[PDB]
Design a protein around this ligand. Structure first.
Ligand SMILES: CC[C@](C)(CN)N1CCOCC1
Ligand SMILES: CC[C@](C)(CN)N1CCOCC1
Length: 330
């Protein structure tokens, strides 16, 4: 089997991407944030505290003839931005772009933090990291990918995120028309439950490539690119007027600037992030100070190749017995 679904930026800054997902019988279609940095499939639901729902589409298990309460199972997640959610668990039929999994754990939110409530466009998350990070207790549950894997033509999914445009998540096959050149594969460590890999270095604009190992995770659920302070300083040093602002919480730059590209290494290959991808617009409405798309990971404990980086590439998440990551230009 295979599946193919279009993923769409939620706003004009590509803050996140939503992908339609069919849950239950008859289908209830929710727009989920596919997140390769977490491993829970959780949704706004009929059980969510009413005051904590603000425009989201909800999953109503009682209207699904295939939904079954997973007795005694609860979940609770606290992401790395203070946001959180928790609730109970059903198993139900879940389909993505024509690919169907029966008995998928669907985590129904009883509570969500304000940061999720405010995102009216995101009806939940579909985690695509390793199932070892799944928060369901007392019996940990598998991701959609993990459940689908054996049935797939090939045990892979790919992320093809667009810049200010729709893109594609494919399951079970590589679309060889969706990228240029070849795919460079690189080793993955699953020890932290992430798609964790090591970049071979970077360049700023037309500058010389610096060979240096940078460990990090491929995370479709993070907006920006978080890298070591040395790397980030080197980048923003090339932008007149750029500075790290403690009050804003990162590097800012004059909105009138044209940004340099940023290149990262994948083995001997190179992925170029165009400068425009690194512009996340005014810090507040009407401001001429703009927020940078490359930020320091110093306060995080891990480097994160989020959407800023990933949308510059065609990315293969290879779930073979020994997982690997593939990157191609596009
Ligand atoms: C998780 C909440 C958060 C960070 C903030 N409301 N969203 C912002 C929009 O893009 C998805 C993530
Ligand atoms: C991801 C960047 C983010 C959170 C997008 N809403 N902002 C931060 C503040 O300056 C403008 C950009």
């Amino acid at each position: 089997s295979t599946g193919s679904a279009t993923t769409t930026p939620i706003d004009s800054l590509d803050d996140a991407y939503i992908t339609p997902v069919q849950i239950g019988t008859p289908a209830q279609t929710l727009n989920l944030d596919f997140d390769t940095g977490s491993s829970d499939l959780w949704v706004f639901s009929s059980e969510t505290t009413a005051s904590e729902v603000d425009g989201q589409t909800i999953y109503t298990p009682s209207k699904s003839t295939t939904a079954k309460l997973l007795s005694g199972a609860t979940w609770s997640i606290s992401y790395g931005d203070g946001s959180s959610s928790s609730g109970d668990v059903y198993t139900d039929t879940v389909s993505v772009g024509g690919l169907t999994v029966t008995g998928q754990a669907v985590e129904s939110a009883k509570k969500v933090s304000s940061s999720f409530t405010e995102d009216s466009t995101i009806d939940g998350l579909l985690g695509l990291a390793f199932s070892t990070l799944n928060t369901v207790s007392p019996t940990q549950q598998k991701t959609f990918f993990d459940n689908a894997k054996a049935s797939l033509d090939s045990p892979v999914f790919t992320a093809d995120l667009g810049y200010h445009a729709p893109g594609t998540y494919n399951f079970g096959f590589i679309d060889t028309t969706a990228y240029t050149g070849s795919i460079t594969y690189t080793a993955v460590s699953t020890k932290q439950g992430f798609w964790e890999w090591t970049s071979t270095g970077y360049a700023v604009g037309s500058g010389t490539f610096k060979s240096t190992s940078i460990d990090g995770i491929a995370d479709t659920g993070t907006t920006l690119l978080y890298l070591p302070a040395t790397v980030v300083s080197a980048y923003w040093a090339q932008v007149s007027g750029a500075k790290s602002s403690s009050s804003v919480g990162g590097y800012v730059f004059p909105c009138s600037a044209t940004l340099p590209s940023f290149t990262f290494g994948v083995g001997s290959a190179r992925i170029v992030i165009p400068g425009d991808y690194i512009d996340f617009g005014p810090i507040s409405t009407g401001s001429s100070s703009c927020f940078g798309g490359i930020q320091s990971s110093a306060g995080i404990g891990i480097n994160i190749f989020g959407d800023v980086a990933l949308k510059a590439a065609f990315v293969v998440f290879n779930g073979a017995t020994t997982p690997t990551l593939g990157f191609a230009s596009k």
